Design a protein around this motif. Structure first.
Motif, PDB file in Angstrom:
ATOM      1  N   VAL A  30       2.204 -11.101   0.742  1.00  0.00           N
ATOM      2  CA  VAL A  30       3.124 -10.580   1.747  1.00  0.00           C
ATOM      3  C   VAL A  30       2.641 -11.056   3.110  1.00  0.00           C
ATOM      4  O   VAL A  30       1.485 -10.835   3.483  1.00  0.00           O
ATOM      5  CB  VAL A  30       3.215  -9.049   1.692  1.00  0.00           C
ATOM      6  N   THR A  31       3.525 -11.716   3.855  1.00  0.00           N
ATOM      7  CA  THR A  31       3.179 -12.181   5.191  1.00  0.00           C
ATOM      8  C   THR A  31       3.020 -11.001   6.143  1.00  0.00           C
ATOM      9  O   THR A  31       3.732  -9.997   6.041  1.00  0.00           O
ATOM     10  CB  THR A  31       4.248 -13.138   5.717  1.00  0.00           C
ATOM     11  N   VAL A  32       2.078 -11.127   7.075  1.00  0.00           N
ATOM     12  CA  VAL A  32       1.793 -10.092   8.060  1.00  0.00           C
ATOM     13  C   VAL A  32       2.012 -10.667   9.452  1.00  0.00           C
ATOM     14  O   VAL A  32       1.644 -11.815   9.726  1.00  0.00           O
ATOM     15  CB  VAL A  32       0.356  -9.545   7.918  1.00  0.00           C
ATOM     16  N   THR A  33       2.613  -9.870  10.329  1.00  0.00           N
ATOM     17  CA  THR A  33       2.880 -10.260  11.707  1.00  0.00           C
ATOM     18  C   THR A  33       1.861  -9.598  12.625  1.00  0.00           C
ATOM     19  O   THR A  33       1.540  -8.417  12.455  1.00  0.00           O
ATOM     20  CB  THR A  33       4.300  -9.869  12.125  1.00  0.00           C
ATOM     21  N   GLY A  34       1.358 -10.361  13.590  1.00  0.00           N
ATOM     22  CA  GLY A  34       0.393  -9.839  14.543  1.00  0.00           C
ATOM     23  C   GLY A  34      -0.953  -9.482  13.951  1.00  0.00           C
ATOM     24  O   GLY A  34      -1.558  -8.481  14.356  1.00  0.00           O
ATOM     25  N   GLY A  35      -1.439 -10.276  13.000  1.00  0.00           N
ATOM     26  CA  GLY A  35      -2.742 -10.030  12.412  1.00  0.00           C
ATOM     27  C   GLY A  35      -3.277 -11.268  11.727  1.00  0.00           C
ATOM     28  O   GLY A  35      -2.519 -12.125  11.260  1.00  0.00           O
ATOM     29  N   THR A  36      -4.603 -11.348  11.669  1.00  0.00           N
ATOM     30  CA  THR A  36      -5.301 -12.451  11.027  1.00  0.00           C
ATOM     31  C   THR A  36      -6.198 -11.914   9.920  1.00  0.00           C
ATOM     32  O   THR A  36      -7.004 -11.007  10.147  1.00  0.00           O
ATOM     33  CB  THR A  36      -6.139 -13.248  12.036  1.00  0.00           C
ATOM     34  N   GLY A  37      -6.052 -12.480   8.724  1.00  0.00           N
ATOM     35  CA  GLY A  37      -6.830 -12.046   7.582  1.00  0.00           C
ATOM     36  C   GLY A  37      -6.206 -10.876   6.850  1.00  0.00           C
ATOM     37  O   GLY A  37      -6.625 -10.531   5.741  1.00  0.00           O
ATOM     38  N   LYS A  38      -5.200 -10.253   7.469  1.00  0.00           N
ATOM     39  CA  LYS A  38      -4.517  -9.129   6.836  1.00  0.00           C
ATOM     40  C   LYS A  38      -3.716  -9.573   5.618  1.00  0.00           C
ATOM     41  O   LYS A  38      -3.535  -8.791   4.678  1.00  0.00           O
ATOM     42  CB  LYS A  38      -3.608  -8.434   7.850  1.00  0.00           C
ATOM     43  N   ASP A  39      -3.239 -10.816   5.612  1.00  0.00           N
ATOM     44  CA  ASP A  39      -2.427 -11.338   4.517  1.00  0.00           C
ATOM     45  C   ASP A  39      -3.345 -11.730   3.364  1.00  0.00           C
ATOM     46  O   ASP A  39      -4.244 -12.561   3.528  1.00  0.00           O
ATOM     47  CB  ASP A  39      -1.592 -12.528   4.984  1.00  0.00           C
ATOM     48  N   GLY A  40      -3.123 -11.124   2.202  1.00  0.00           N
ATOM     49  CA  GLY A  40      -3.898 -11.451   1.022  1.00  0.00           C
ATOM     50  C   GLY A  40      -3.121 -11.121  -0.228  1.00  0.00           C
ATOM     51  O   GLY A  40      -2.216 -10.280  -0.212  1.00  0.00           O
ATOM     52  N   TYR A  41      -3.476 -11.789  -1.323  1.00  0.00           N
ATOM     53  CA  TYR A  41      -2.804 -11.545  -2.592  1.00  0.00           C
ATOM     54  C   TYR A  41      -3.207 -10.184  -3.145  1.00  0.00           C
ATOM     55  O   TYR A  41      -4.395  -9.859  -3.225  1.00  0.00           O
ATOM     56  CB  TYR A  41      -3.143 -12.642  -3.603  1.00  0.00           C
ATOM     57  N   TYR A  42      -2.214  -9.388  -3.530  1.00  0.00           N
ATOM     58  CA  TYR A  42      -2.438  -8.096  -4.154  1.00  0.00           C
ATOM     59  C   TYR A  42      -2.044  -8.164  -5.623  1.00  0.00           C
ATOM     60  O   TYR A  42      -1.159  -8.928  -6.017  1.00  0.00           O
ATOM     61  CB  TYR A  42      -1.648  -6.983  -3.450  1.00  0.00           C
ATOM     62  N   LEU A  55       7.819   1.328  -9.658  1.00  0.00           N
ATOM     63  CA  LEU A  55       6.499   1.580  -9.095  1.00  0.00           C
ATOM     64  C   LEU A  55       5.781   2.627  -9.934  1.00  0.00           C
ATOM     65  O   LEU A  55       6.333   3.701 -10.199  1.00  0.00           O
ATOM     66  CB  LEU A  55       6.605   2.044  -7.641  1.00  0.00           C
ATOM     67  N   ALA A  56       4.558   2.313 -10.351  1.00  0.00           N
ATOM     68  CA  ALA A  56       3.770   3.207 -11.187  1.00  0.00           C
ATOM     69  C   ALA A  56       2.809   4.017 -10.327  1.00  0.00           C
ATOM     70  O   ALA A  56       1.996   3.451  -9.588  1.00  0.00           O
ATOM     71  CB  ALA A  56       2.997   2.417 -12.243  1.00  0.00           C
ATOM     72  N   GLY A  57       2.908   5.343 -10.425  1.00  0.00           N
ATOM     73  CA  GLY A  57       2.026   6.238  -9.712  1.00  0.00           C
ATOM     74  C   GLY A  57       2.434   6.551  -8.289  1.00  0.00           C
ATOM     75  O   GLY A  57       1.791   7.397  -7.651  1.00  0.00           O
ATOM     76  N   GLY A  58       3.478   5.909  -7.772  1.00  0.00           N
ATOM     77  CA  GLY A  58       3.894   6.151  -6.399  1.00  0.00           C
ATOM     78  C   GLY A  58       2.852   5.770  -5.371  1.00  0.00           C
ATOM     79  O   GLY A  58       2.587   6.545  -4.442  1.00  0.00           O
ATOM     80  N   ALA A  59       2.249   4.591  -5.515  1.00  0.00           N
ATOM     81  CA  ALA A  59       1.198   4.135  -4.605  1.00  0.00           C
ATOM     82  C   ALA A  59       1.848   3.343  -3.478  1.00  0.00           C
ATOM     83  O   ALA A  59       1.938   2.116  -3.519  1.00  0.00           O
ATOM     84  CB  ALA A  59       0.162   3.306  -5.351  1.00  0.00           C
ATOM     85  N   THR A  60       2.308   4.061  -2.451  1.00  0.00           N
ATOM     86  CA  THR A  60       2.922   3.407  -1.300  1.00  0.00           C
ATOM     87  C   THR A  60       1.880   2.726  -0.422  1.00  0.00           C
ATOM     88  O   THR A  60       2.138   1.649   0.128  1.00  0.00           O
ATOM     89  CB  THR A  60       3.723   4.422  -0.483  1.00  0.00           C
ATOM     90  N   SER A  61       0.710   3.335  -0.277  1.00  0.00           N
ATOM     91  CA  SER A  61      -0.338   2.754   0.552  1.00  0.00           C
ATOM     92  C   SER A  61      -0.918   1.517  -0.126  1.00  0.00           C
ATOM     93  O   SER A  61      -1.168   1.541  -1.338  1.00  0.00           O
ATOM     94  CB  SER A  61      -1.438   3.780   0.814  1.00  0.00           C
ATOM     95  N   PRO A  62      -1.138   0.427   0.605  1.00  0.00           N
ATOM     96  CA  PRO A  62      -1.738  -0.762  -0.009  1.00  0.00           C
ATOM     97  C   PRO A  62      -3.195  -0.527  -0.374  1.00  0.00           C
ATOM     98  O   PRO A  62      -3.844   0.398   0.119  1.00  0.00           O
ATOM     99  CB  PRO A  62      -1.603  -1.832   1.081  1.00  0.00           C
ATOM    100  N   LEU A  63      -3.701  -1.380  -1.263  1.00  0.00           N
ATOM    101  CA  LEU A  63      -5.090  -1.292  -1.686  1.00  0.00           C
ATOM    102  C   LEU A  63      -6.026  -1.509  -0.500  1.00  0.00           C
ATOM    103  O   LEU A  63      -5.825  -2.396   0.335  1.00  0.00           O
ATOM    104  CB  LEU A  63      -5.383  -2.317  -2.783  1.00  0.00           C
TER     105      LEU A  63
END
Length: 150
Positions: A30-42, A55-63
């Motif tokens: 997922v591309t991130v705006t206004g940040g460096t290193g924030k973009d990573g494969y999940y 969605l399993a478990g309702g995990a809205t917050s990213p890892l």
């Protein structure tokens, strides 16, 4: 559908996709705006039969952890599990026979007890086609060429 459900304007992965056997789960970037290193494969799970985003478990917050360490190396190698047998099933459908396929080895049960590998000859009918295991493990269709009446 997965890209739209995950959010954002666009999430399609550019270039070759990444698969690792040890991880066992797909990578979503997922591309991130206004940040460096924030973009990573999940790590995400995709169900092909279901056909819809669940969605399993309702995990809205990213890892947590910021940039994930499990997804840091780019590898161009493409391999799939042996249970897929895409080329084998395609060859069988070209022949027109479907069912359970058995592999054999060019061996003899005798006093010596010979054992010589016969490749991935995983064939259904008693007529066991010779499919060749490659250097990288790919199953290869070795069919001899003949000139017919045409």
């Amino acid at each position: 559908a997965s890209a739209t459900g995950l959010g954002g304007t666009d999430q399609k992965i550019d270039g070759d996709l990444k698969f690792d056997d040890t991880t066992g789960k797909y990578y979503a970037k997922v591309t991130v705006t206004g940040g460096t290193g924030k973009d990573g494969y999940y790590e995400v799970s995709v169900d092909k039969t279901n056909g819809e985003v669940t969605l399993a478990g309702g995990a809205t917050s990213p890892l947590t952890g910021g940039l994930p360490a499990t997804a840091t190396e780019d590898v161009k190698n493409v391999q799939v599990a042996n249970a897929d047998l895409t080329e084998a099933k395609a060859a069988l459908t070209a022949a027109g026979v479907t069912g359970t396929a058995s592999v054999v080895k060019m061996s003899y049960t005798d006093n010596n007890g010979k054992t010589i590998d016969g490749g991935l000859a995983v064939k259904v009918g008693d007529d066991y086609y010779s499919a060749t295991q490659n250097k990288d493990g790919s199953i290869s269709i070795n069919t001899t060429k003949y000139t017919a009446d045409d």
